[PDB]
Amino acid sequence: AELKYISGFGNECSSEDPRCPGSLPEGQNNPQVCPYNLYAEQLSGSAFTCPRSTNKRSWLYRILPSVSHKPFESIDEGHVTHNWDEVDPDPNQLRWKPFEIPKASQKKVDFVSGLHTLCGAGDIKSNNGLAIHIFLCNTSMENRCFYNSDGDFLIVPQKGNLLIYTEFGKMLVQPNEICVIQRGMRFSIDVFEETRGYILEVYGVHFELPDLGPIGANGLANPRDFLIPIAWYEDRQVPGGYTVINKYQGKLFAAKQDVSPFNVVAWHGNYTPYKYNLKNFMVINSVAFDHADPSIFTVLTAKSVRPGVAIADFVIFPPRWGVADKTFRPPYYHRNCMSEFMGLIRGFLPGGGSLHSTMTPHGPDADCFEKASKVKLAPERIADGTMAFMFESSLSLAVTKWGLKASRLKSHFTPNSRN
């Protein structure tokens, strides 16, 4: 059966499992005894003193508070790392073939076990950084959940659907859709095949919709298309213990508890997981001449404190009309102060990627330059049946050891002839 959702990016939402009407306290957050005898638990996504525009928190009315668990124990990190200095810097463009997914025949690997950090920058405990990870897995998480104490996750499936269980409800996230799981939120993922995808992790900050500037009040990723799960719970005891995996200061820890963490009967707040279908992106671009800068395709942004400068932006290159006359339509040659990671949902193949590091020259190849400089221009369809994206950062990304192991024009100048 298919899941229902609440819509509205950043909304102050209220949701009760349909089986327990009125589980949300009426007119208050902390009754002496909560309806149905539940426990009230607050998840604070921002400092308490943040202004209305940035204050984030959710109240969870659950069967047992999250404190009921045994002590965390250190587990092996696998390929999740934040040591940006084990590998010497390298300005050259890097390219990756679609990352290899392990076969279930060979090794049963769930989403957490198949998490591999590709590159990143910044300090984790300081709320200034990011990391890009690739998930390669083939089995559903069983009696195991995961939460990130360090920051937020923008998850981008490429091959394989994700059925995601969160304390706020469930989300089905398919390729060409994305979802965000914010700091502290426990989640579990069921897969249905050899699965591969990308994850943009930002330290201590949250994603927002970009101010539209001249675009105005509508356009790009409309708020209404962001979908939030409806409350759903399970009161399930787990023989042998349910395991909660914790990414804390970049290391992984495991804590056993008696029941599943998804026992939230009702919740309200503006700090929740969410998903978005990329096909709903209202594409804005040039309709007369010239080529628009790629920031015009920004979906979500994790703002730095410097005005207009992002820690990390999520940008997409969707199906659209190309109509610019007397214009070089392909991407212009470019040297940029930002790092540019590029992925492909559906030259690399879907599931691979490239990294253009800061100020390293890039641009179209000889064949693309030649073809675009000669074609009679007319309205054409671009990117149909494809979906490329970019994670761009203001920091200088550094590839990890694993990231490295996994990796791979003529002059026409007529001095005397202007026209």
Annotated binding site for Fe cation: 334, 340, 362
**Cα(30)–Cα(58) distance, integer angstroms:** 13
**Would you give the binding string for a second copy spanning residues 151-170, x where CB under 8 A is met?**
--------------------
Chosen residue from 5, 44, 78, 144 binding a second copy by CB under 8 A: 44
Tokens 């589980």 found at: 23
Nearest distance in Å: CB 174, Fe ion: 28
Q: Which stretch binds a second copy (CB under 8 A): 105-113, 193-201, 250-258, 346-354?
A: 250-258
Residues facing 242 on adjacent strands = 257
User: Judged by CB under 5 A, does residue 57 bind Fe ion?
Assistant: no
Q: Please answer whether residues 15 and 61 qualify as being in contact, where contact means their C-beta atoms are separated by less than 8 angstroms.
A: no
Using CB under 5 A as the criterion, what x/- string covers residues 169-208 for binding Fe ion? ----------------------------------------
- Of these residues, 86, 340, 370, 380, which one is catalytic? 340
- Within 361-390, the residues that bind a second copy by CB under 8 A are 361-363, 369, 372-373, 377, 379
> How does DSSP classify residue 171?
E
Cα separations (Å) of 361 from 93, 328, 337, 364?
9, 18, 11, 11
Instruction: Out of 18, 100, 142, 249, point to the residue binding a second copy (CB under 8 A).
Output: 249
Residue 161 interaction partner, one of a second copy, Fe ion, none, beta carbon < 5-8 Å per kind: none
Concatenate the DSSP letters of all residues of 206-248 into one string. --BPPP-GGGTTS-BS-GGGEEEEPP-----EEEEEEEEEEEE
What, of a second copy, Fe ion, none, does residue 95 touch, CB below 5 to 8 Å by kind? none
| Closest distance to Fe ion from the beta carbon of 132 (Å) | 17
Residue 10 vs 331, nearer CB to Fe ion? 331
> Among 4, 103, 142, 292, which residue sits at the site for a second copy (rule: CB under 8 A)?
292
283 touches a second copy by CB under 8 A: yes
Binding residues are 334, 340, 362
Task: Give the dihedral sign, CA 366/290/294/173.
Answer: negative
Q: State which of residues 30, 76, 347, 385 lies at the interface with a second copy (CB under 8 A).
A: 30
CA atoms within 13 A of residue 65's CA, in its CB half-sphere: 8
Buried b (16+ CB within 10 A) or exposed e, 91-113: eeebebebbebbeeeeeebbbbb
Among positions 5, 39, 143, 161, the unique one binding a second copy when judged by CB under 8 A: 39
Quickly count: other Cβ atoms within 10 Å of residue 213's Cβ: 7
Of 111-150, binders to a second copy (CB under 8 A) are 121-129, 147-150
At CA 166, angle to CA 60 and CA 388, rounded to 5?
135
Q: Which residue carries 């009760």 as its tokens?
A: 16
Judged by CB under 5 A, the number of residues near Fe ion is 2
The DSSP line for 43-93 is: EESS-TT--TTT--EEEEEESS-TT-SPPPEE---TB----TTSS----S-
Q: Shortest distance, CB of residue 179 to a second copy, whole angstroms?
A: 17
The Cα 21–Cα 285 span in angstroms is 47
Residue among 31, 86, 142, 349 that touches a second copy (CB under 8 A): 31
Q: Which residue's structure tokens are 């339509």?
A: 329
Q: Is 291 a catalytic residue?
A: yes
Q: Does 206 participate in catalysis according to the annotation? A: no
Concerning whether 334 is annotated as a catalytic residue, the answer is: yes
Question: Can you give the length of the chain in residues?
Answer: 419
Q: Give yes or no for residue 334 binding Fe ion (CB under 5 A).
A: yes
Nearest to Fe ion of 57, 334 (CB atom): 334
Q: Which of 291, 370, 380, 412 is catalytic?
A: 291
And the tokens for 240?
């042998």
**Is 194 among the residues known to form the active site?**
no
Interacting positions 47-66 with a second copy (CB under 8 A): 47-55, 57, 63-66
| DSSP assigned state of 333 | P
Give the residue among 220, 206, 396 at the shortest CA–CA distance from 301: 206
Contact between 68 and a second copy (CB under 8 A)? yes
DSSP 8-state secondary structure symbol assigned to residue 334: B
Query: Cβ closer to a second copy: 101 or 399?
Result: 399
Q: Which of the following is catalytic: 12, 356, 370, 380?
A: 356
Of 78, 140, 176, 208, the one binding a second copy (CB under 8 A) is 208
196 makes contact, choosing from a second copy, Fe ion, none, with CB < 5 to 8 Å by partner type, with: none
Enumerate the active-site residues: 291, 334, 340, 356, 362
Q: Where do contacts with Fe ion occur on this chain (CB under 5 A)?
A: 334, 336
